[PDB]
Amino acid sequence: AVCPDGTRVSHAACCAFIPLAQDLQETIFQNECGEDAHEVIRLTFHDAIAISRSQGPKAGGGADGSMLLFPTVEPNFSANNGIDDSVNNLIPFMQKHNTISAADLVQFAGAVALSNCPGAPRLEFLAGRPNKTIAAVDGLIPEPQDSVTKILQRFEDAGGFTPFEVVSLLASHSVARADKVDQTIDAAPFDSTPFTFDTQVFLEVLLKGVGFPGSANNTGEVASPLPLGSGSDTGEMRLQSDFALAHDPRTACIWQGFVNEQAFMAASFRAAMSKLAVLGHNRNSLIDCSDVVPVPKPATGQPAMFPASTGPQDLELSCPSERFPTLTTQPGASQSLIAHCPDGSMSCPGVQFNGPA
Ligand code: HEM
Ligand SMILES: *[C@@H]1O[C@H](CO)[C@@H](O[C@@H]2O[C@H](CO)[C@@H](O)[C@H](O)[C@H]2NC(C)=O)[C@H](O)[C@H]1NC(C)=O
Numbered sequence: 001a002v003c004p005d006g007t008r009v010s011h012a013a014c015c016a017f018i019p020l021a022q023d024l025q026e027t028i029f030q031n032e033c034g035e036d037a038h039e040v041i042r043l044t045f046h047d048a049i050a051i052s053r054s055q056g057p058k059a060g061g062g063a064d065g066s067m068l069l070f071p072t073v074e075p076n077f078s079a080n081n082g083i084d085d086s087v088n089n090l091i092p093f094m095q096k097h098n099t100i101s102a103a104d105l106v107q108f109a110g111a112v113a114l115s116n117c118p119g120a121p122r123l124e125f126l127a128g129r130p131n132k133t134i135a136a137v138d139g140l141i142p143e144p145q146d147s148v149t150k151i152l153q154r155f156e157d158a159g160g161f162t163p164f165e166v167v168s169l170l171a172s173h174s175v176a177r178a179d180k181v182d183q184t185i186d187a188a189p190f191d192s193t194p195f196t197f198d199t200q201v202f203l204e205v206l207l208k209g210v211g212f213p214g215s216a217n218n219t220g221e222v223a224s225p226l227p228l229g230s231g232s233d234t235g236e237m238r239l240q241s242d243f244a245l246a247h248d249p250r251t252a253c254i255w256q257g258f259v260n261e262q263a264f265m266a267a268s269f270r271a272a273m274s275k276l277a278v279l280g281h282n283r284n285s286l287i288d289c290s291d292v293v294p295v296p297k298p299a300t301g302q303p304a305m306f307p308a309s310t311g312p313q314d315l316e317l318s319c320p321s322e323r324f325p326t327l328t329t330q331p332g333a334s335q336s337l338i339a340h341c342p343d344g345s346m347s348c349p350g351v352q353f354n355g356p357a
């Protein structure tokens, strides 16, 4: 089909997603893998994973836009702390781009945001999820204090995900920060390149922790290898769950297997997101609108490297059957600050709309 702007696409129903991507980029992402991008990518996961095979449909409808349609329910569960900003940022698009369901809006916005992170894959994007659902029940969202057994069970109950798929989805912690885990600091990144969809998080979680970016007693947190921060350049945070996954026998070799394996990580993440994005639906009932997902920013192609102040002697390895790769170390004797902003500064405020969440 030919869309009103002249774009030739796969199916006419995909046309509306073109001005929606443009509006999302101009209004809240500005083609950056920044704060607003980060928040929407986390929303795609919290929207989608609130579903349970064992409890039945009444517990949640999966990737169904329930966070936007019932903005006062799920966003207020304690495990969803901080999700309110992303919901309030997307509700104005749901109202304006009113031929696209809330559910499709959430998934597509996540795809658009990810395309702004260098190295990310171009997600599949299927369309057609209905615009009506129910609010999910509490307890469906994994939490960073949870054990690996609990986490793996939640993902298996939610949609059959294997441990490989679970760690695959956690490549999203390559472009991720924490505002709520420690209330004294904001925007504590999970790797040293939170604007770049690279394998650094897999490497860095395997380094011995030496301190905390804020306080030392937060639930769900463990010591960080790069805790130094200054001004708004908050030090690296480590989640207990990421640490646990990197060392548990079920997932340790999978975790290590992504270190310095960019294309493998990105392809694996795309495969797992293809499953996540259609939870609560039959994929044979959704139309393929992948050609309207923006093409992602390419990686530079550089190998993973130890950040300065760290090196191979700091590794805490847990996979007996796979050799840890030979990596170089960035020069310098002390840690570099992790930039608060994509262009290197500390001043880059994200557009935020007020809203009901
Ligand atoms: C065991 C699984 C997971 C747990 C327990 C976990 C936990 C967390 C925590 C606690 C935060 C910090 C929020 C805050 O305090 O501000 C967060 C951030 C984030 N998570 Fe996860 N998550 C996991 C899986 C996922 C998955 C599968 C994705 C998406 C595919 C995702 C993407 C992100 C993103 C993008 C952020 C950054 C949000 C921002 O910077 O504002 N996470 N995660
Ligand atoms: C999906 O459901 C939402 C919520 O009912 C609809 O949102 C309304 O959209 C109109 C414009 O069509 C606005 O005037 C309302 O203010 C919106 N409601 C709320 C509570 O925000 C949306 O239109 C529906 N989209 C589709 C594709 O049916």
Ligand SMILES: *[C@H]1O[C@H](CO)[C@@H](O)[C@H](O)[C@@H]1O
Binding pocket: 308, 330, 331, 332, 333, 334, 335, 336, 337
């Ligand atoms: C980042 O900053 C540290 C100093 O804090 C250096 O050691 C490193 O080489 C990089 O310039």
Ligand SMILES: [Ca+2]
Binding pocket: 046, 047, 048, 049, 050, 060, 061, 062, 063, 064, 065, 066, 067, 136
């Ligand atoms: Ca949902």
Ligand SMILES: [Ca+2]
Binding pocket: 173, 174, 175, 191, 192, 193, 194, 195, 196, 197, 198, 199, 200, 201
């Ligand atoms: Ca990164």
